Amino acid sequence: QNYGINLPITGSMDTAYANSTQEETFLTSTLCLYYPTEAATEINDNSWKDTLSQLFLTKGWPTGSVYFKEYTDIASFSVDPQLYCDYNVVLMKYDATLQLDMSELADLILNEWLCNPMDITLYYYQQTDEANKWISMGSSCTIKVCPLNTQTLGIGCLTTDTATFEEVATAEKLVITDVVDGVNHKLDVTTATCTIRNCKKLGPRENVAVIQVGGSDVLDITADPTTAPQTERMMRINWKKWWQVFYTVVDYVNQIIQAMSKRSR
Amino acid sequence: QNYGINLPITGSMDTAYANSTQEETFLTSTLCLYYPTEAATEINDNSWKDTLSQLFLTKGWPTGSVYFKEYTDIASFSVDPQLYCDYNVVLMKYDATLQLDMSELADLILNEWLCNPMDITLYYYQQTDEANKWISMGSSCTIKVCPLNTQTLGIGCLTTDTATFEEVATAEKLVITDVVDGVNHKLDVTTATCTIRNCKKLGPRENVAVIQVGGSDVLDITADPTTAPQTERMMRINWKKWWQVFYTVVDYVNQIIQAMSKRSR
Amino acid sequence: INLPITGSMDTAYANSTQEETFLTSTLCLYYPTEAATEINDNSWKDTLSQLFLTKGWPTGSVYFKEYTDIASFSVDPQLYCDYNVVLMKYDATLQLDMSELADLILNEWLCNPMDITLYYYQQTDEANKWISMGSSCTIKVCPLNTQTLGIGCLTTDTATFEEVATAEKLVITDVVDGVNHKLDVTTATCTIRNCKKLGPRENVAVIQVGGSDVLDITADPTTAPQTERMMRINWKKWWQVFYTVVDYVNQIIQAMSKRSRSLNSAAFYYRI
Amino acid sequence: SVGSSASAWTDVSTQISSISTQTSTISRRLRLKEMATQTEGM
Amino acid sequence: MDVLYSLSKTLKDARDKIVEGTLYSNVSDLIQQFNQMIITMNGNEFQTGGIGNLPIRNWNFDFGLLGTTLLNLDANYVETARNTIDYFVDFVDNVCMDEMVRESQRNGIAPQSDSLRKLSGIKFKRINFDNSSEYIENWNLQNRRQRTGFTFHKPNIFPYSASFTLNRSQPAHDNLMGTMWLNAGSEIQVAGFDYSCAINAPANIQQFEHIVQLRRVLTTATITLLPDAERFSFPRVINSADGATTWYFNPVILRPNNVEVEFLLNGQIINTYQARFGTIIARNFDTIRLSFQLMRPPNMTPAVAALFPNAQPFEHHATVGLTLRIESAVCESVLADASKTMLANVTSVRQEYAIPVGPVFPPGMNWTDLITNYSPSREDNLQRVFTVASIRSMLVK
Ligand SMILES: *[C@@H]1O[C@H](CO)[C@@H](O)[C@H](O)[C@H]1NC(C)=O
Ligand SMILES: *[C@@H]1O[C@H](CO)[C@@H](O)[C@H](O)[C@H]1NC(C)=O
Ligand SMILES: *[C@@H]1O[C@H](CO)[C@@H](O)[C@H](O)[C@H]1NC(C)=O
Ligand SMILES: [Ca+2]
Ligand SMILES: [Ca+2]
Ligand SMILES: [Ca+2]
Ligand SMILES: [Ca+2]
Ligand SMILES: [Ca+2]
Ligand SMILES: [Ca+2]
Ligand SMILES: [Ca+2]
Ligand SMILES: [Ca+2]
Ligand SMILES: [Ca+2]
């Protein structure tokens, strides 16, 4: 029962397959849907949560293990998304005017981050690798960054004249900032309405599953423009209503939870 | 030092992996970015070029090896693109009204064409194999084709009444025409404004890297409607600003140069 | 390819590649407007094509590309064909212009651009020259010493420089190889590039339609060579010229040879 | 390490016969031995 | 050498036949031979050693004969025989260990390990009993020139060579035509690979030919020929010719059509097999020519058509393979096998007693660099050391 330590784990190829964890994990686990206000609006019903729970009960998920958690907008959801459940599913609308915001949302929830804090007024910070990004939440973040040279002086900017800085965010609720890795950047942020955190991307978060309800799969999780991956828990639907979407989610719940795996942390 | 010959090569599997050529090719080669005027407009900084060069300096490229070359629009760049560097990067905006134009631009710069001239007035041409196409450039092209039968007469068109011809282009700056391969065609083209060349498609140009800064991957390099490939040097990005895009390029330039390989010709 | 070739002397001569290189290659004549004017016809191109069709060259292989004058052609010659023939007239005033045209098209150049206001360049070997094209290139040069000061010129007063080129559309400047020069040029009209001469371009073929052989390809005044694809004709008309060309085209293409270096539509390679 | 154990004098690299390559690479450091005073002759 | 083999054979037959209870009618001849050996030996002083960690031992032979007085054997006879045999046995073992570690480019057959030279005289020739072994029979034959042969099972005639040949290449390594091969021991796994699947070639066909030139002729070879070489048939990241860059190889296997395997001799063909797979024969051959083809499938279902497009990307690479294992063979010269231990004995003796590299055998006796240049000096010395190694393994395995 050793914690905080990693050892080898041996095995063999003559072992047999154990009984299915399904029909017991469904009982001992919980499943939390994150749907938009548009769905409740187009539905106009007060018992649809109980309806979907009684439906899930046919797939085995008991009545008290299934939770629903509305979110008024993708941005208001990207503002501190607190996903605390044993199996999280998210339904995400498509909006070309919010492509990067709903890609940053994915890059934040699909992945697992180790977030240390930042003190802009005191220190000047830098990145070290291709996974050490700066994640800023809040109501409206206006970020500006001035790179520095070897002698702690600006490069195309002035350490005092803040208006010379380079604005990489204009009133965004969630920003993921990647800058040149190997130089010290001085930041200017509206720290009264936004909190910034120096976050390192660890191995992915296997507990969530995004479902783009609309257009083609555009989400570029990885910053580097060479991978453009598409993981197993990044699904896509074409839609005209929401009852069909929810019935499809229900009918294919088992596949979703097969695509999802409980966390290792 | 034989030229213009193909000789057998030999090798082995016992040789060791030599030291890395990055940080030596970065010095003994050149880099050339192509950006849209929209970026300089949104930026409004007269020192961003020297700033980005000083940032590249950290990644290895010296100061007098990087070049920025503006271009007003995708079509105005497609008109006679004279790329001469050792590593070329192109930024490209997404516009559904320009899908085919900015796919033709890709099919032109990404690939390597062997281009002979064309004399519309005298000759009636044909395509031999699936890789002989007719690429036309200029300020505004208007191409009209008429196939012919075995006895040099038209098929749904009249060799005198040009109006009877079929219109494949309408006021286009760049056109790539693939017609039925094996029949003699007559053409009418406004040769005052546009030049048309009969080109043959060869192995790819490994020197250029296109970066679609916007919506989903639509670029169909290959004209056959079966492959629809996405290559290594065909990238996608989501954006809301431009400083962030250039910082991304600068931080992941080594990946770009790993996805690109210097020319063979 | 740096690997070696091998062979033998007992192997036999294979069949003729002529009568197939015609089928799988293209030819491109570059004639002057004077010819079209003297002729005063419209289907002479179709005539020459139907004539070529007997010598083997098929219909859609021959091309005729007009040029108004030697200098207009010299300004950025865009030769892109598998076989290029050029007919060029004789003029004692344009002697050097149409020797520089020869030096440019007959030979293959590797060109790097130049930034004059910000830098000062020199030459290294006997084959690194400076080629300037455009409407009118008026170049002046001032050599310098190790400590950036003038030799027989003043770095400020442009009027003290040494004017090597006065109102020329194509200039090929060779200066002393080893010293740093400062240049004054009409950048608004002309662009000047530092170009090293590679091996010859075996894809083109010049034909001096007039007087004696004057072309000095190599800038050194010791060689004065006469290459294979540099012909001479005497003329009183142009129909006789074109008929001679057509009747003796196989010899022209036997004196030419498709390139080896690479595919490129310019008359010189660009490598920054 | 072409030898008993790791020695910076015997670390072949930048190979752009195997024994011939190894010997040439090891000999390109005896020029440094020369002006490091571990020689005996002229 | 023949007298050494006779010594070893009679000592072996003595350790075996001369056992308690047995009958004198079975060992009369062997006892006479043992007594004659003792007679011809008694009165000579031998020295062995003086190279590496081999210690300088001295042998002085003063032994007594065996009285032909009994009918059955008792322990008082066997024990005398054993205390006379152990000395000769360790003497022969030390002689062999001193002879396996000596070389010469000048008359390698001519003996070394001067005790053995002394034994090669004419006063010792009365010891010969029978030259029955294969190696010693071939030695006697080669001395009295005649057609010899060593029968080998899975001979290691091929030196390890794993390498490719690219007849069409680019810096990016995106459209390639070539052949990879691994020739190791008794097996050749060859595979030609085209990334275009022969879309540009005449009749949609691309040829490949592998020419393997052995150093020594073979005879009566039994061979197992199969398609679909296994080790060049899965994804790979291979290095360039110059070892600087790397390239990817994602193969998809096809069958060789118009396959042709030709066993030649001095450029003259000897055997030719066209479209026969499995077990085959080769009566005499120095060169092997394996010539196969990659023929694009004229009729393709969608699943396979999606892999061979008419454009340059080519993310699946068509391959055509051939495995060829030489199971048995018969060679006029000496080699290594998977049946016999002589090479192991030799290399083990040298690695144990720390022998400096000689002027003939390469360091560590690496069979690869020993068969890459199978010079006649190396061949003679290898035959000599293998013969004496057999002679030693007949006593101490
Ligand atoms: C799991 O299912 C198999 C197949 O029916 C069965 O043999 C096994 O007993 C089951 N395991 C348990 C723990 O019920
Ligand atoms: C590559 O790295 C190795 C290990 O540090 C070094 O020995 C070698 O010199 C390097 N290559 C070059 C060209 O410096
Ligand atoms: C070469 O010419 C000879 C004589 O006309 C002819 O027999 C032969 O077939 C020709 N070669 C080829 C490849 O056709
Ligand atoms: Ca955002
Ligand atoms: Ca970064
Ligand atoms: Ca600024
Ligand atoms: Ca177009
Ligand atoms: Ca019509
Ligand atoms: Ca076509
Ligand atoms: Ca001139
Ligand atoms: Ca002066
Ligand atoms: Ca000069």
mmCIF file of N, CA, C and O in Angstrom, chain A residues 48-113:
data_model
loop_
_atom_site.group_PDB
_atom_site.id
_atom_site.type_symbol
_atom_site.label_atom_id
_atom_site.label_comp_id
_atom_site.label_asym_id
_atom_site.label_seq_id
_atom_site.Cartn_x
_atom_site.Cartn_y
_atom_site.Cartn_z
ATOM 1 N N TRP A 48 -37.954 16.420 -16.622
ATOM 2 C CA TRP A 48 -37.119 15.711 -17.583
ATOM 3 C C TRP A 48 -35.878 15.120 -16.928
ATOM 4 O O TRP A 48 -35.356 14.108 -17.407
ATOM 5 N N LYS A 49 -35.400 15.715 -15.834
ATOM 6 C CA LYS A 49 -34.295 15.110 -15.097
ATOM 7 C C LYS A 49 -34.700 13.756 -14.527
ATOM 8 O O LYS A 49 -33.971 12.766 -14.663
ATOM 9 N N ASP A 50 -35.871 13.695 -13.888
ATOM 10 C CA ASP A 50 -36.373 12.423 -13.378
ATOM 11 C C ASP A 50 -36.636 11.440 -14.512
ATOM 12 O O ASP A 50 -36.417 10.232 -14.360
ATOM 13 N N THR A 51 -37.128 11.940 -15.649
ATOM 14 C CA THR A 51 -37.341 11.085 -16.816
ATOM 15 C C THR A 51 -36.039 10.437 -17.269
ATOM 16 O O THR A 51 -35.967 9.215 -17.456
ATOM 17 N N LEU A 52 -34.993 11.246 -17.451
ATOM 18 C CA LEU A 52 -33.711 10.701 -17.878
ATOM 19 C C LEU A 52 -33.115 9.782 -16.824
ATOM 20 O O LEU A 52 -32.435 8.811 -17.168
ATOM 21 N N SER A 53 -33.375 10.046 -15.543
ATOM 22 C CA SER A 53 -32.871 9.160 -14.499
ATOM 23 C C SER A 53 -33.550 7.796 -14.568
ATOM 24 O O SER A 53 -32.885 6.755 -14.500
ATOM 25 N N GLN A 54 -34.880 7.785 -14.690
ATOM 26 C CA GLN A 54 -35.603 6.529 -14.874
ATOM 27 C C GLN A 54 -35.191 5.818 -16.157
ATOM 28 O O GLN A 54 -35.290 4.588 -16.240
ATOM 29 N N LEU A 55 -34.740 6.564 -17.168
ATOM 30 C CA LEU A 55 -34.258 5.929 -18.392
ATOM 31 C C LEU A 55 -32.905 5.263 -18.166
ATOM 32 O O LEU A 55 -32.729 4.080 -18.481
ATOM 33 N N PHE A 56 -31.926 6.027 -17.669
ATOM 34 C CA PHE A 56 -30.639 5.518 -17.196
ATOM 35 C C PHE A 56 -30.769 4.258 -16.343
ATOM 36 O O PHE A 56 -29.942 3.342 -16.444
ATOM 37 N N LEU A 57 -31.784 4.225 -15.469
ATOM 38 C CA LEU A 57 -32.072 3.030 -14.676
ATOM 39 C C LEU A 57 -32.243 1.774 -15.528
ATOM 40 O O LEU A 57 -31.982 0.664 -15.050
ATOM 41 N N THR A 58 -32.674 1.917 -16.787
ATOM 42 C CA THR A 58 -32.753 0.757 -17.669
ATOM 43 C C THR A 58 -31.371 0.330 -18.147
ATOM 44 O O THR A 58 -31.151 -0.858 -18.414
ATOM 45 N N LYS A 59 -30.436 1.273 -18.259
ATOM 46 C CA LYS A 59 -29.042 0.953 -18.542
ATOM 47 C C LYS A 59 -28.253 0.566 -17.297
ATOM 48 O O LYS A 59 -27.073 0.221 -17.423
ATOM 49 N N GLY A 60 -28.862 0.628 -16.109
ATOM 50 C CA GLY A 60 -28.269 0.142 -14.880
ATOM 51 C C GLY A 60 -27.890 1.226 -13.895
ATOM 52 O O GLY A 60 -27.780 0.941 -12.695
ATOM 53 N N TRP A 61 -27.682 2.447 -14.362
ATOM 54 C CA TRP A 61 -27.314 3.545 -13.479
ATOM 55 C C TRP A 61 -28.458 3.846 -12.513
ATOM 56 O O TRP A 61 -29.539 4.236 -12.969
ATOM 57 N N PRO A 62 -28.283 3.688 -11.171
ATOM 58 C CA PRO A 62 -29.414 3.942 -10.264
ATOM 59 C C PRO A 62 -29.870 5.393 -10.260
ATOM 60 O O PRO A 62 -29.262 6.251 -10.908
ATOM 61 N N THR A 63 -30.947 5.675 -9.523
ATOM 62 C CA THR A 63 -31.613 6.966 -9.644
ATOM 63 C C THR A 63 -30.819 8.084 -8.981
ATOM 64 O O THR A 63 -30.851 9.224 -9.459
ATOM 65 N N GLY A 64 -30.101 7.786 -7.900
ATOM 66 C CA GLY A 64 -29.337 8.783 -7.182
ATOM 67 C C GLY A 64 -27.893 8.938 -7.601
ATOM 68 O O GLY A 64 -27.204 9.818 -7.077
ATOM 69 N N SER A 65 -27.409 8.116 -8.534
ATOM 70 C CA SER A 65 -26.056 8.233 -9.063
ATOM 71 C C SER A 65 -25.948 9.195 -10.239
ATOM 72 O O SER A 65 -24.827 9.584 -10.593
ATOM 73 N N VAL A 66 -27.067 9.584 -10.851
ATOM 74 C CA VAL A 66 -27.075 10.441 -12.031
ATOM 75 C C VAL A 66 -27.399 11.863 -11.597
ATOM 76 O O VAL A 66 -28.406 12.099 -10.917
ATOM 77 N N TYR A 67 -26.543 12.804 -11.993
ATOM 78 C CA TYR A 67 -26.681 14.216 -11.669
ATOM 79 C C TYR A 67 -26.668 15.033 -12.951
ATOM 80 O O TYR A 67 -26.021 14.666 -13.935
ATOM 81 N N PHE A 68 -27.414 16.132 -12.933
ATOM 82 C CA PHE A 68 -27.417 17.125 -13.997
ATOM 83 C C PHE A 68 -26.961 18.455 -13.418
ATOM 84 O O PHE A 68 -27.288 18.783 -12.273
ATOM 85 N N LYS A 69 -26.201 19.218 -14.205
ATOM 86 C CA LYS A 69 -25.642 20.492 -13.745
ATOM 87 C C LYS A 69 -25.638 21.456 -14.927
ATOM 88 O O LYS A 69 -24.725 21.435 -15.757
ATOM 89 N N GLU A 70 -26.674 22.288 -14.990
ATOM 90 C CA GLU A 70 -26.819 23.299 -16.025
ATOM 91 C C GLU A 70 -25.623 24.250 -16.041
ATOM 92 O O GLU A 70 -24.882 24.383 -15.063
ATOM 93 N N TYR A 71 -25.444 24.918 -17.180
ATOM 94 C CA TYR A 71 -24.464 25.990 -17.307
ATOM 95 C C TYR A 71 -24.981 26.967 -18.352
ATOM 96 O O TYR A 71 -25.336 26.566 -19.466
ATOM 97 N N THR A 72 -25.070 28.242 -17.971
ATOM 98 C CA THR A 72 -25.749 29.221 -18.816
ATOM 99 C C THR A 72 -24.980 29.500 -20.102
ATOM 100 O O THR A 72 -25.594 29.850 -21.116
ATOM 101 N N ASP A 73 -23.657 29.360 -20.093
ATOM 102 C CA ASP A 73 -22.875 29.633 -21.292
ATOM 103 C C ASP A 73 -21.500 28.995 -21.153
ATOM 104 O O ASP A 73 -21.026 28.722 -20.045
ATOM 105 N N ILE A 74 -20.880 28.744 -22.312
ATOM 106 C CA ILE A 74 -19.555 28.128 -22.366
ATOM 107 C C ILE A 74 -18.540 28.955 -21.586
ATOM 108 O O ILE A 74 -17.641 28.407 -20.940
ATOM 109 N N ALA A 75 -18.683 30.281 -21.605
ATOM 110 C CA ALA A 75 -17.734 31.136 -20.899
ATOM 111 C C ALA A 75 -17.968 31.077 -19.393
ATOM 112 O O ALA A 75 -17.025 30.905 -18.610
ATOM 113 N N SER A 76 -19.227 31.224 -18.969
ATOM 114 C CA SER A 76 -19.581 31.078 -17.559
ATOM 115 C C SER A 76 -19.276 29.687 -17.006
ATOM 116 O O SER A 76 -19.222 29.524 -15.782
ATOM 117 N N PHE A 77 -19.077 28.690 -17.870
ATOM 118 C CA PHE A 77 -18.649 27.359 -17.459
ATOM 119 C C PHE A 77 -17.131 27.256 -17.399
ATOM 120 O O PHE A 77 -16.585 26.702 -16.439
ATOM 121 N N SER A 78 -16.438 27.782 -18.416
ATOM 122 C CA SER A 78 -14.986 27.935 -18.375
ATOM 123 C C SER A 78 -14.498 28.742 -17.175
ATOM 124 O O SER A 78 -13.329 28.613 -16.795
ATOM 125 N N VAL A 79 -15.353 29.568 -16.573
ATOM 126 C CA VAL A 79 -14.984 30.313 -15.369
ATOM 127 C C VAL A 79 -15.022 29.329 -14.204
ATOM 128 O O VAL A 79 -16.089 29.031 -13.664
ATOM 129 N N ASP A 80 -13.841 28.852 -13.794
ATOM 130 C CA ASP A 80 -13.659 27.913 -12.691
ATOM 131 C C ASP A 80 -14.554 26.685 -12.835
ATOM 132 O O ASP A 80 -15.502 26.519 -12.056
ATOM 133 N N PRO A 81 -14.302 25.799 -13.813
ATOM 134 C CA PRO A 81 -15.114 24.581 -13.926
ATOM 135 C C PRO A 81 -14.697 23.565 -12.875
ATOM 136 O O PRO A 81 -13.592 23.017 -12.920
ATOM 137 N N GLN A 82 -15.593 23.309 -11.924
ATOM 138 C CA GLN A 82 -15.334 22.421 -10.791
ATOM 139 C C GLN A 82 -16.040 21.099 -11.076
ATOM 140 O O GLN A 82 -17.183 20.883 -10.672
ATOM 141 N N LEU A 83 -15.341 20.211 -11.779
ATOM 142 C CA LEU A 83 -15.868 18.897 -12.142
ATOM 143 C C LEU A 83 -15.445 17.913 -11.061
ATOM 144 O O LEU A 83 -14.310 17.426 -11.063
ATOM 145 N N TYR A 84 -16.356 17.623 -10.133
ATOM 146 C CA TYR A 84 -16.125 16.662 -9.054
ATOM 147 C C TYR A 84 -17.178 15.565 -9.158
ATOM 148 O O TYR A 84 -18.200 15.603 -8.471
ATOM 149 N N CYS A 85 -16.877 14.543 -9.955
ATOM 150 C CA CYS A 85 -17.745 13.385 -10.119
ATOM 151 C C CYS A 85 -16.884 12.226 -10.593
ATOM 152 O O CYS A 85 -15.747 12.417 -11.030
ATOM 153 N N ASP A 86 -17.438 11.017 -10.496
ATOM 154 C CA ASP A 86 -16.719 9.833 -10.943
ATOM 155 C C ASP A 86 -16.808 9.607 -12.449
ATOM 156 O O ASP A 86 -16.013 8.827 -12.979
ATOM 157 N N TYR A 87 -17.740 10.267 -13.144
ATOM 158 C CA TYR A 87 -17.799 10.222 -14.608
ATOM 159 C C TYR A 87 -18.492 11.490 -15.090
ATOM 160 O O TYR A 87 -19.706 11.621 -14.926
ATOM 161 N N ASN A 88 -17.743 12.405 -15.707
ATOM 162 C CA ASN A 88 -18.279 13.681 -16.168
ATOM 163 C C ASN A 88 -18.500 13.648 -17.675
ATOM 164 O O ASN A 88 -17.613 13.236 -18.430
ATOM 165 N N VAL A 89 -19.684 14.075 -18.106
ATOM 166 C CA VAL A 89 -20.008 14.245 -19.517
ATOM 167 C C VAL A 89 -20.435 15.690 -19.720
ATOM 168 O O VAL A 89 -21.129 16.263 -18.874
ATOM 169 N N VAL A 90 -20.016 16.273 -20.841
ATOM 170 C CA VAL A 90 -20.267 17.673 -21.160
ATOM 171 C C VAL A 90 -20.812 17.745 -22.576
ATOM 172 O O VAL A 90 -20.309 17.061 -23.475
ATOM 173 N N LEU A 91 -21.835 18.576 -22.772
ATOM 174 C CA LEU A 91 -22.428 18.825 -24.082
ATOM 175 C C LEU A 91 -22.120 20.265 -24.459
ATOM 176 O O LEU A 91 -22.479 21.189 -23.722
ATOM 177 N N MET A 92 -21.469 20.451 -25.608
ATOM 178 C CA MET A 92 -20.870 21.724 -25.991
ATOM 179 C C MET A 92 -21.417 22.141 -27.346
ATOM 180 O O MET A 92 -21.266 21.411 -28.328
ATOM 181 N N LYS A 93 -22.023 23.322 -27.403
ATOM 182 C CA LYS A 93 -22.509 23.848 -28.668
ATOM 183 C C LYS A 93 -21.347 24.352 -29.517
ATOM 184 O O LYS A 93 -20.237 24.578 -29.025
ATOM 185 N N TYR A 94 -21.621 24.533 -30.806
ATOM 186 C CA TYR A 94 -20.632 24.972 -31.782
ATOM 187 C C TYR A 94 -20.905 26.421 -32.154
ATOM 188 O O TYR A 94 -22.040 26.780 -32.487
ATOM 189 N N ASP A 95 -19.858 27.240 -32.105
ATOM 190 C CA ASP A 95 -19.951 28.663 -32.423
ATOM 191 C C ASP A 95 -18.578 29.100 -32.906
ATOM 192 O O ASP A 95 -17.643 29.178 -32.102
ATOM 193 N N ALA A 96 -18.449 29.348 -34.215
ATOM 194 C CA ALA A 96 -17.175 29.791 -34.782
ATOM 195 C C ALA A 96 -16.644 31.052 -34.107
ATOM 196 O O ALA A 96 -15.425 31.251 -34.043
ATOM 197 N N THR A 97 -17.530 31.912 -33.598
ATOM 198 C CA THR A 97 -17.102 33.075 -32.829
ATOM 199 C C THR A 97 -16.598 32.722 -31.432
ATOM 200 O O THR A 97 -16.085 33.613 -30.745
ATOM 201 N N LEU A 98 -16.733 31.459 -30.997
ATOM 202 C CA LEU A 98 -16.225 30.984 -29.713
ATOM 203 C C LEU A 98 -15.350 29.747 -29.881
ATOM 204 O O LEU A 98 -15.218 28.956 -28.939
ATOM 205 N N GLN A 99 -14.779 29.554 -31.076
ATOM 206 C CA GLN A 99 -13.964 28.376 -31.363
ATOM 207 C C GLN A 99 -12.793 28.254 -30.394
ATOM 208 O O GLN A 99 -12.601 27.208 -29.761
ATOM 209 N N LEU A 100 -12.004 29.319 -30.251
ATOM 210 C CA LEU A 100 -10.836 29.239 -29.382
ATOM 211 C C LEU A 100 -11.234 29.167 -27.915
ATOM 212 O O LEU A 100 -10.541 28.518 -27.126
ATOM 213 N N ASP A 101 -12.334 29.812 -27.522
ATOM 214 C CA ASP A 101 -12.751 29.731 -26.126
ATOM 215 C C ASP A 101 -13.192 28.317 -25.766
ATOM 216 O O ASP A 101 -12.813 27.791 -24.710
ATOM 217 N N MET A 102 -13.937 27.663 -26.657
ATOM 218 C CA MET A 102 -14.379 26.299 -26.407
ATOM 219 C C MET A 102 -13.321 25.261 -26.762
ATOM 220 O O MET A 102 -13.550 24.068 -26.531
ATOM 221 N N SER A 103 -12.181 25.681 -27.317
ATOM 222 C CA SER A 103 -10.999 24.833 -27.395
ATOM 223 C C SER A 103 -10.152 24.940 -26.134
ATOM 224 O O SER A 103 -9.613 23.935 -25.664
ATOM 225 N N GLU A 104 -10.002 26.154 -25.600
ATOM 226 C CA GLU A 104 -9.332 26.331 -24.317
ATOM 227 C C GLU A 104 -10.072 25.603 -23.202
ATOM 228 O O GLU A 104 -9.442 25.018 -22.313
ATOM 229 N N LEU A 105 -11.409 25.667 -23.209
ATOM 230 C CA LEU A 105 -12.208 24.885 -22.265
ATOM 231 C C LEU A 105 -11.850 23.404 -22.322
ATOM 232 O O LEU A 105 -11.668 22.751 -21.284
ATOM 233 N N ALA A 106 -11.763 22.854 -23.535
ATOM 234 C CA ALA A 106 -11.394 21.453 -23.702
ATOM 235 C C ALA A 106 -9.985 21.194 -23.184
ATOM 236 O O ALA A 106 -9.759 20.266 -22.403
ATOM 237 N N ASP A 107 -9.018 22.006 -23.618
ATOM 238 C CA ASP A 107 -7.641 21.889 -23.144
ATOM 239 C C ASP A 107 -7.514 22.020 -21.628
ATOM 240 O O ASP A 107 -6.520 21.552 -21.061
ATOM 241 N N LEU A 108 -8.492 22.634 -20.960
ATOM 242 C CA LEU A 108 -8.474 22.777 -19.511
ATOM 243 C C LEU A 108 -9.113 21.589 -18.803
ATOM 244 O O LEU A 108 -8.580 21.125 -17.788
ATOM 245 N N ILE A 109 -10.230 21.077 -19.318
ATOM 246 C CA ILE A 109 -10.958 20.011 -18.623
ATOM 247 C C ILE A 109 -10.456 18.625 -19.025
ATOM 248 O O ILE A 109 -10.282 17.759 -18.166
ATOM 249 N N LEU A 110 -10.238 18.377 -20.322
ATOM 250 C CA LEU A 110 -9.729 17.084 -20.773
ATOM 251 C C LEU A 110 -8.377 16.745 -20.160
ATOM 252 O O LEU A 110 -8.065 15.563 -19.976
ATOM 253 N N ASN A 111 -7.573 17.753 -19.826
ATOM 254 C CA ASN A 111 -6.224 17.560 -19.320
ATOM 255 C C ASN A 111 -6.164 17.897 -17.838
ATOM 256 O O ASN A 111 -7.025 18.597 -17.298
ATOM 257 N N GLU A 112 -5.122 17.380 -17.189
ATOM 258 C CA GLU A 112 -4.899 17.534 -15.757
ATOM 259 C C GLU A 112 -3.715 18.467 -15.552
ATOM 260 O O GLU A 112 -2.618 18.200 -16.053
ATOM 261 N N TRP A 113 -3.942 19.548 -14.813
ATOM 262 C CA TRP A 113 -2.989 20.633 -14.651
ATOM 263 C C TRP A 113 -2.519 20.721 -13.206
ATOM 264 O O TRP A 113 -3.278 20.452 -12.270
#
